[PDB]
Amino acid sequence: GDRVADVIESSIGDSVSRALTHALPAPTGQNTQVSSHRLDTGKVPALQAA
Amino acid sequence: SDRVAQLTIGNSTITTQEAANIIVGYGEWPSYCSDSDATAVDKPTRPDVSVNRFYTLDTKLWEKSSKGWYWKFPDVLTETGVFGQNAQFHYLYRSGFCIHVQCNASKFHQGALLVAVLPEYVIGTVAGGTGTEDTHPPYKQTQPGADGFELQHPYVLDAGIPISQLTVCPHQWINLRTNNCATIIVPYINALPFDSALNHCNFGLLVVPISPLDYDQGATPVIPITITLAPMCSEFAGLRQAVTQ
Numbered sequence: 001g002d003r004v005a006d007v008i009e010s011s012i013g014d015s016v017s018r019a020l021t022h023a024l025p026a027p028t029g030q031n032t033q034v035s036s037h038r039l040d041t042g043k044v045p046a047l048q049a050a
Numbered sequence: 051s052d053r054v055a056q057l058t059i060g061n062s063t064i065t066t067q068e069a070a071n072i073i074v075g076y077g078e079w080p081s082y083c084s085d086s087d088a089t090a091v092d093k094p095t096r097p098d099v100s101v102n103r104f105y106t107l108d109t110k111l112w113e114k115s116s117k118g119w120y121w122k123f124p125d126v127l128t129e130t131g132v133f134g135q136n137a138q139f140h141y142l143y144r145s146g147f148c149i150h151v152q153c154n155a156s157k158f159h160q161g162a163l164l165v166a167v168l169p170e171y172v173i174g175t176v177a178g179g180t181g182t183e184d185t186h187p188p189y190k191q192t193q194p195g196a197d198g199f200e201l202q203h204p205y206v207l208d209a210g211i212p213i214s215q216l217t218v219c220p221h222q223w224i225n226l227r228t229n230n231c232a233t234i235i236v237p238y239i240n241a242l243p244f245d246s247a248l249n250h251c252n253f254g255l256l257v258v259p260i261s262p263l264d265y266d267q268g269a270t271p272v273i274p275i276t277i278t279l280a281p282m283c284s285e286f287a288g289l290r291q292a293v294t295q
């Protein structure tokens with residue numbers, strides 16, 4: 001048994017692979033949705049940080 | 051009521067008092083491309099009235115010895131009006147056409163023209179006559195522009211196929227004792243949803259005299275054949291700078 005707090009609240013032994021991503025079904029190429037003009041500040045999909 | 055007709059599209063109206071109905075090629079009216087048949091993702095431009103309207107492009111003289119002529123689509127129009135400009139500025143194009151061929155004479159003249167639309171009208175050469183030379187038709191012959199081109203061997207349509215069977219294609223006849231025009235509506239015909247207006251002619255228009263023109267001396271001898279056509283449901287995509295070839 002374990003009485004000291006640090007042993008009780010320990011994550012030593014966690015065997016579960018925590019995954020940040022997951023597979024989704026994708027039998028066809030993605031479709032294209034209608035889009036219109038956007039003249040807006042703050043929102044900027046073209047700009048990135050490689 | 052089958053003989054009188056009015057065609058109005060855009061800022062243009064055509065009238066005829068000696069018609070013979072209207073042919074709708076392959077029994078199908080022109081339409082815009084659906085979202086499931088389409089593949090290109092940019093939003094197309096559909097100019098409407100400024101491009102879907104009648105353009106009168108050329109007049110030929112029917113003579114007792116005429117062989118026949120052909121025009122290629124959309125080639126005939128790539129340098130005319132707002133349609134031409136769009137065909138030049140855009141990579142992709144598609145449209146149907148309303149074709150109205152005109153020819154009036156008098157109740158004392160006679161003759162019959164076959165007016166037909168032949169999709170993918172590939173021109174052949176006489177192969178150096180002996181048939182031993184693999185020669186090819188030059189550009190001015192495959193895409194003659196608004197002037198059209200005269201057939202050298204109408205019987206085989208300059209392509210080794212019988213004009214006697216050309217009626218398996220959308221067509222009408224202009225038989226002078228009966229009518230003075232032919233009207234054919236053609237939907238967009240291609241194995242692709244859109245294509246280049248410059249590199250590819252979807253179909254050719256053929257106007258060939260089958261029963262030669264005749265009349266007695268003293269009757270007006272100048273019998274013109276005028277071609278008027280209108281693009282229908284035009285769509286353009288893939289915009290960049292203007293290109294003519």
Ligand code: NA
Pocket residue numbers: 044045046047048
């Ligand atoms: Na972004």
